[PDB]
Scaffold this active site. Sequence first.
Site, mmCIF file in Angstrom:
data_model
loop_
_atom_site.group_PDB
_atom_site.id
_atom_site.type_symbol
_atom_site.label_atom_id
_atom_site.label_comp_id
_atom_site.label_asym_id
_atom_site.label_seq_id
_atom_site.Cartn_x
_atom_site.Cartn_y
_atom_site.Cartn_z
ATOM 1 N N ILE A 195 69.232 33.935 42.436
ATOM 2 C CA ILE A 195 68.075 34.227 43.240
ATOM 3 C C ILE A 195 67.188 33.003 43.435
ATOM 4 O O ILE A 195 66.524 32.903 44.448
ATOM 5 C CB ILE A 195 67.301 35.426 42.633
ATOM 6 C CG1 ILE A 195 68.184 36.690 42.631
ATOM 7 C CG2 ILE A 195 65.941 35.636 43.317
ATOM 8 C CD1 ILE A 195 67.976 37.616 43.805
ATOM 9 N N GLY A 196 67.204 32.078 42.481
ATOM 10 C CA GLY A 196 66.416 30.854 42.572
ATOM 11 C C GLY A 196 66.121 30.177 41.239
ATOM 12 O O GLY A 196 66.758 30.453 40.218
ATOM 13 N N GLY A 253 64.416 28.073 33.260
ATOM 14 C CA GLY A 253 65.799 28.402 33.579
ATOM 15 C C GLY A 253 65.924 28.764 35.013
ATOM 16 O O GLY A 253 65.021 28.492 35.795
ATOM 17 N N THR A 254 67.060 29.364 35.345
ATOM 18 C CA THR A 254 67.256 29.984 36.653
ATOM 19 C C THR A 254 67.295 31.529 36.526
ATOM 20 O O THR A 254 67.570 32.065 35.452
ATOM 21 C CB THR A 254 68.459 29.340 37.479
ATOM 22 O OG1 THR A 254 69.709 29.634 36.865
ATOM 23 C CG2 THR A 254 68.316 27.803 37.577
ATOM 24 N N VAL A 255 66.979 32.218 37.623
ATOM 25 C CA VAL A 255 66.749 33.667 37.673
ATOM 26 C C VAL A 255 67.932 34.327 38.320
ATOM 27 O O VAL A 255 68.492 33.765 39.252
ATOM 28 C CB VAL A 255 65.519 33.961 38.575
ATOM 29 C CG1 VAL A 255 65.440 35.420 39.050
ATOM 30 C CG2 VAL A 255 64.282 33.557 37.869
ATOM 31 N N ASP A 295 49.894 29.304 35.076
ATOM 32 C CA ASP A 295 50.724 29.149 36.251
ATOM 33 C C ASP A 295 50.704 30.406 37.120
ATOM 34 O O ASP A 295 51.723 30.816 37.711
ATOM 35 C CB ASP A 295 52.175 28.737 35.908
ATOM 36 C CG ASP A 295 52.937 28.146 37.144
ATOM 37 O OD1 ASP A 295 52.320 27.395 37.995
ATOM 38 O OD2 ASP A 295 54.156 28.467 37.274
HETATM 39 C C1 LIG Z 1 64.361 28.342 45.439
HETATM 40 N N1 LIG Z 1 65.220 28.940 46.512
HETATM 41 C C2 LIG Z 1 66.330 29.723 45.919
HETATM 42 C C3 LIG Z 1 64.566 29.720 47.618
HETATM 43 C C4 LIG Z 1 64.490 31.223 47.386
HETATM 44 O O1 LIG Z 1 63.396 31.291 46.469
HETATM 45 C C5 LIG Z 1 63.141 32.161 45.405
HETATM 46 C C6 LIG Z 1 62.910 33.544 45.613
HETATM 47 C C7 LIG Z 1 62.608 34.451 44.573
HETATM 48 C C8 LIG Z 1 62.489 33.998 43.261
HETATM 49 C C9 LIG Z 1 62.208 34.967 42.114
HETATM 50 N N2 LIG Z 1 61.937 34.644 40.839
HETATM 51 C C10 LIG Z 1 61.787 35.767 40.108
HETATM 52 C C11 LIG Z 1 61.523 35.744 38.645
HETATM 53 C C12 LIG Z 1 60.637 34.848 38.040
HETATM 54 C C13 LIG Z 1 60.483 34.848 36.634
HETATM 55 C C14 LIG Z 1 61.244 35.750 35.868
HETATM 56 C C15 LIG Z 1 62.136 36.605 36.473
HETATM 57 C C16 LIG Z 1 62.291 36.594 37.856
HETATM 58 C C17 LIG Z 1 62.891 37.495 35.491
HETATM 59 C C18 LIG Z 1 62.374 37.062 34.113
HETATM 60 C C19 LIG Z 1 61.318 36.007 34.393
HETATM 61 N N3 LIG Z 1 60.661 35.508 33.430
HETATM 62 O O2 LIG Z 1 59.657 34.563 33.579
HETATM 63 C C20 LIG Z 1 61.982 36.877 40.935
HETATM 64 C C21 LIG Z 1 61.970 38.370 40.590
HETATM 65 C C22 LIG Z 1 61.448 38.881 39.391
HETATM 66 C C23 LIG Z 1 61.507 40.236 39.122
HETATM 67 N N4 LIG Z 1 62.076 41.078 39.982
HETATM 68 C C24 LIG Z 1 62.601 40.644 41.122
HETATM 69 C C25 LIG Z 1 62.574 39.290 41.446
HETATM 70 N N5 LIG Z 1 62.240 36.334 42.145
HETATM 71 C C26 LIG Z 1 62.732 32.621 43.038
HETATM 72 C C27 LIG Z 1 63.023 31.699 44.084
#
Ligand SMILES: CN(C)CCOc1ccc(-c2nc(-c3ccc4c(c3)CC/C4=N/O)c(-c3ccncc3)[nH]2)cc1
Length: 259
Positions: free
Chosen positions: A15-16, A21-23, A128
Amino acid sequence: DWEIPDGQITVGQRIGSGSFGTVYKGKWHGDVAVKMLNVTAPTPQQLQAFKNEVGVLRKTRHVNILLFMGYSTKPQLAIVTQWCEGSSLYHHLHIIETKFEMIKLIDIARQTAQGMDYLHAKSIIHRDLKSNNIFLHEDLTVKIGDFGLATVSGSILWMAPEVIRMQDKNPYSFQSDVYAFGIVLYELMTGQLPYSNINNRDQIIFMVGRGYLSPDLSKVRSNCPKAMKRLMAECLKKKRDERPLFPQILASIELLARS
Ligand SMILES: CN(C)CCOc1ccc(-c2nc(-c3ccc4c(c3)CC/C4=N/O)c(-c3ccncc3)[nH]2)cc1
């Protein structure tokens, strides 16, 4: 207890990037959100980071905080949370620019305010908060997330000046968590990122921390109450100590909410 039995988590899609780490989207007794750390055999410095974050997430339980389910280390250092169907706010206001409605934008404001209140009472400092760490779950409910920086260079446009000036090794404070909440207001109130007409990070960094540059508060939707206007102002106030704390912010929001 919080360590998830090993090899119980599936992971599908990616997801990103997160903060350590990465998610990813994954399974563990349902749809869940997992943030892990690839890196097979990782640093003393790194699994510190993780031991820390976990140490803080374990302490949260509250609607408006993304809900920590478990963590594992075998085969990798992974934090798990509820899955938010929906998007981050960021991704609403600035990817697919969701015309939201002004009562909903104050609701989002206030739900964040609620979460930050909760955090601070527990003496947690996010360090943050930004519209990327706010996931809007089933469009109605807000969950603050990403506790990589939390405690007891990050993302720039929500940095209060004194974080920027980097005056002493530790210049963080509820007060700073508040300046960022104010940029979140600025986004909510203007469907926009601050400082849009400047493309040189380094410059912004400098200019904001020195006081020369600050959000153009006159870009705020007209439908917007003026008390919420005054609030953002009080929130962003350059002088650290002038900024109200969350209890008082919550109050202000809730109040004017009866309109
Ligand atoms: C960077 N590139 C891939 C462009 C596209 O961008 C992104 C789009 C979306 C995201 C994105 N980060 C999270 C995220 C961030 C932090 C954490 C988690 C998910 C799970 C555990 C955690 N701990 O800190 C989510 C998300 C979280 C919960 N439920 C659904 C989604 N979504 C990250 C980047």
